[PDB]
Amino acid sequence: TGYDLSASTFSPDGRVFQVEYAMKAVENSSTAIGIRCKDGVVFGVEKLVLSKLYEEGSNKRLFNVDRHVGMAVAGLLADARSLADIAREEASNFRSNFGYNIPLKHLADRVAMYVHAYTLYSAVRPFGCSFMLGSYSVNDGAQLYMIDPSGVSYGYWGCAIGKARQAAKTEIEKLQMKEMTCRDIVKEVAKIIYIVHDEVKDKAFELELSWVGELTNGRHEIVPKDIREEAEKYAKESLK
């Protein structure tokens, strides 16, 4: 106390509490995980139905930055739509100036510097968001990135954001990841969401799945969700 007000003052042991406070504000949100196979990236977001609260299909946290780049946001919601507007704007200037598609390594770096810029001044606050970045390219492969509210950005083969983070990543490493095709992984990601989040906290939940990869010709789109319906059928085989 006394040092935790601004984001421009250091603590007398060497850190900044305003960044520390906004990190666990992301922790209070629901679980969004991500994983990549050898020829694609699979997204999965648990979404909570409160009582009715919306027409189903509302405010989906799987955004769409570029034709080959996708989001998976968690934490606060309104600032996540702001970062989506920054990332769509950044990929357009790369297209206009340099004439080809944005690499995911640069797109992570340009956004993370912008997230970093709101951690230095007393006039603005740090962001309360954290998200994922998935892409695919035949000259590059499948890449999966991860950005905290502080601005640290690097890669993963799999990651998880939300309340269930450490409890949700214990079973991610139990899988094989190299030899898998992503269509097998689509029904895999369904059970990790379905194992965690017992209905004691919230009775109603709902699953989204986004999916970019070699089968989707590099373009990013949602899964055929009502089609083929093997998410929920194969997930509810975890009864014992």
């Binding site: 009715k52 919306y54 027409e55 405010n59």
Partner: peptide
């Protein structure tokens, strides 16, 4: 005011909308 727009089908906001919502799901 937190700027979280919701694609709903029937809502009510303001003073004692608590009772207004309860009528909606039993006739939605």
């Amino acid at each position: 005011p937190s700027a979280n727009y919701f694609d709903c089908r029937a809502m009510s906001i303001g003073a004692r909308s608590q009772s207004a919502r309860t009528y909606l799901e039993r006739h939605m």
